[PDB]
Amino acid sequence: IINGEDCSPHSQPWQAALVMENELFCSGVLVHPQWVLSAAHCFQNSYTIGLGLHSLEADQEPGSQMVEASLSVRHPEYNRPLLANDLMLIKLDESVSESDTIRSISIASQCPTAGNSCLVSGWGLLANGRMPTVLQCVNVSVVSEEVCSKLYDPLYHPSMFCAGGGQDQKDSCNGDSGGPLICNGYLQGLVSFGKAPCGQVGVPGVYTNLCKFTEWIEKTVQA
């Protein structure tokens, strides 16, 4: 997270850390007790998922859980076309027990509103080029479809939306993939991609447009 600040501890209790061999590679978002949503580009054959964290070290975080997961369901049309449909559902080996620090978040049924200021959180790169110790939070502004298309054509697709690009250089960056973008208190997007480098004025990042996938998500959960 570029130009954010420490999240209030446990204020984003749906945040999931995706780690393997003890190193973070993406985040995800708890959307039901047994289900973590993440970007499809974060797919691996198995996962160790950290829930209830603030720092990434579970042994330093009361109430946290490191849950195993082997099964994930990529959206079947992920990357067809390229970068589109960037979501997957990770099935935890067992349901979590939701608590004060581990909680699912409702997914937006309505699509992003241009100009909305939405919160993004993660343990990805900071403005100073380092990785944070604790979860970072920043707000970014949803950009119109018209501008998103101009920047990202011909790969722009309605499974995507743009946010950020402000003079403030607030953005998500490497390590933030798969984590949440929250508008109106609902999960609106997942961190997906951008033009390198992160934080360019006038070049918003791109997020998975979850309002397009609520049916697919629940179909997967119920099947």
Added chain:
Amino acid sequence: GRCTKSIPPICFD
């Protein structure tokens, strides 16, 4: 230069 925000980034321009 369209890169995902994973570690490492997956870069597709």
